[PDB]
Design a protein around this ligand. Structure first.
Ligand SMILES: O=C(N[C@@H]1[C@@H](O)[C@H](O)[C@@H](CO)O[C@H]1O)OCc1ccccc1
Ligand SMILES: O=C(N[C@@H]1[C@@H](O)[C@H](O)[C@@H](CO)O[C@H]1O)OCc1ccccc1
Lengths: 367, 367
């Protein structure tokens, strides 16, 4: 159903001359902190979705470098092909106003301005800048609508409310309820797929749950230790990020060691290393606190953890002890005395898929 | 829109008028102690006219509403009830599927639409809303009738307003997200999301009030309330009637008798130093709801609504109190990048039942 081809800039040029690619096109771009995958999507035979993209490196760590890539693409591509571009959607790893202005970025310098992009890739009134988890959320909806939900998402635990509005198995469809998508990677991403009961419609509402000040449990001292390193009141992202895992790893080993990065800490936990595993537990404990607060504030039917990080950490979630402690923490809220946290079904992405690119495409269709 | 409070019998009379011979919407605004229910019509020159009767919630039970509906059906002509084409009520609790009103703080039982009479609640044209979901539909109704500056006053203009809108702050809702806060008996919250893709606003219900409060430099003050409640304080615990009483008891330290919220507000309006200090403290946690939500939800506007807000006008007009409220709304680590400054704050400056306007507007989107 879901098809993405990674190619060099030149292989892409040739692929598009195929009679298969002689149809209407959407320009799409998934932009992250290091790299960006940009290219073209078509509708395929038997209702399928086929994309071809090339990887660019964000060498300059500047969001305005994207313009170069667009121009590079327009010249180095045949006009016949560009003429079939009927819609243009990219995502960026920051907050976006009016689908047009991508806001201050943690990693990257500058501001994403739709009005500076070339109209041959971004047709007026048929183009948009999304936040990366806005795109993610359109992706989750694309997966549900293509009926392959259980191919790509696995249930972590079923909540109370699932059977009250759905008779199908948990994880077989997104559900006629709000879905909160959380992407713990470089940054902590969050979007709310709102469910409008009047018209049974799902709508993607971007969030910045990651930049909320962390509320206390019994961790006052642990929060204050990071407060004194950052010289900032910790937010969720400070505890649930690359930097966050490093922090938990430094707090566990209780002494100087030679450097290991988040990457190295994950690799070590997958090899059975006690200390790295305790770092991952700690990380997942703050991730579940984002969930318990948001389970009350936003009343989701489902919470879905998405991204490469989540798929690559499958070793962590398969362990039923890790899952049991995550679940205990997801219920660790005063409002659990009335069942609010128990209501919620948690899922995780269990198979690699660029949600963001599928989401840029679904967004292009609604436009 | 014109509303009129009448006894059960006068209501019966008014509807026999040839003026009320037209298609009707049933509406109900249900609160802690009372409920206003009746009928809305479209008038000549696009006017909007409503007629309701008051009921008291003697039982403090949500299921008593059924009686009121039955009482209305018998004591009304069949001719009249037959012109009911839509049915919308609001309740002071969280609602799933527009049909089931979840456990309530103030009242016993569960609001089930499926138990209401179809004569007032036509299938597929009826809904139970949360009180601030209704409030949100109201704010939209006021904006669309071009009288936004009649009912709302700017407290301060944020930096995002002039990019998104060329009309004056407070003259329209805005093509952006509006977070509506109702600090009354309970703390109400809803988010009027603005779709970029289409210029459509949708009301997203929230329970911001029940989130655990994140600290500033107030660990001891939070812990004082922690020890009285035997629960981790949430925003509602600090920003409610119980909240005001707490702030007052802390100010006096047993120097003076205890007080109701009503009493405390009356005294601050008369210039009582202690009561004023209690109101500052209350407004300090209200602005923390706003600063945390300004990051999480990225609103263009925050609007404070309700009789409470209108009746406390004296508090917001004092430029000292407003300057300190503003300082506190910017009290957030993410202000170093402008996020809290983005947001325009307004207050309801003239009485209006937003919820009843909202039940009606909701009905229109349904029929
Ligand atoms: O950038 C964002 N927030 C971004 C989110 O938009 C994004 O979804 C997430 C996943 O990529 O990373 C967060 O860091 O916040 C603005 C900000 C935060 C911190 C410093 C500067 C700017
Ligand atoms: O009742 C609600 N929350 C209600 C809100 O829905 C409502 O909008 C607000 C103003 O009317 O009061 C809150 O208290 O939460 C569930 C709850 C909270 C505390 C104890 C029991 C149940």
């Amino acid at each position: 159903a879901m098809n993405i081809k990674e190619l060099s800039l030149h292989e892409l040029c040739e692929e598009l001359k195929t009679p298969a690619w002689n149809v209407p096109l959407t320009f799409v771009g998934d932009v992250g902190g290091t790299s960006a995958r940009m290219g073209f999507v078509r509708e395929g035979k038997n209702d399928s979705v086929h994309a071809c993209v090339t990887r660019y490196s964000m060498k300059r760590k500047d969001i305005t470098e994207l313009i170069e890539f667009f121009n590079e693409i327009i010249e180095l591509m045949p006009a016949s092909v560009i003429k079939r571009v009927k819609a243009g959607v990219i995502n960026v790893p920051g907050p976006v106003t009016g689908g047009a202005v991508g806001g201050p970025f943690n990693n990257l310098k500058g501001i994403a301005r739709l009005s500076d992009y070339p109209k041959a890739l971004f047709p007026p009134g048929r183009s948009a800048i999304l936040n990366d988890l806005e795109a993610g959320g359109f992706g989750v909806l694309a997966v549900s609508d293509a009926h392959v939900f259980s191919e790509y998402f696995g249930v972590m635990w079923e909540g109370t409310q699932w059977r009250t509005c759905e008779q199908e198995p948990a994880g077989s469809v997104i559900g006629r309820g709000r879905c909160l998508v959380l992407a713990p990677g470089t940054g902590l991403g969050s979007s709310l797929i709102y469910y409008n009961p009047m018209n049974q419609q799902h709508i993607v509402v971007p969030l910045e749950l990651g930049s909320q000040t962390i509320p206390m449990r019994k961790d006052i001292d642990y929060i204050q230790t990071l407060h004194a390193e950052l010289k900032l009141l910790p937010n969720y992202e400070n505890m649930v990020s690359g930097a966050g895992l490093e922090f938990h790893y430094r707090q566990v080993v209780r002494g100087s060691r030679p450097p290991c990065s988040a990457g190295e800490i994950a690799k070590l936990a997958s090899e059975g290393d006690a200390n790295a595993c305790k770092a991952m537990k700690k990380y997942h404990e703050y991730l579940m606190r984002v969930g318990s607060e948001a389970s009350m504030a936003l009343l989701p039917l489902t919470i879905v953890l998405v991204g490469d990080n989540i798929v690559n950490n499958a070793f962590f979630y398969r362990n039923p002890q890790n899952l049991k402690e995550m679940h205990r923490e997801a219920l660790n809220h005063e409002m659990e005395r009335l069942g609010f946290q128990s209501r919620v079904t948690y899922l995780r992405q269990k198979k690699l898929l660029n949600l963001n690119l599928m989401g840029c495409y679904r967004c292009g269709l609604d436009l």
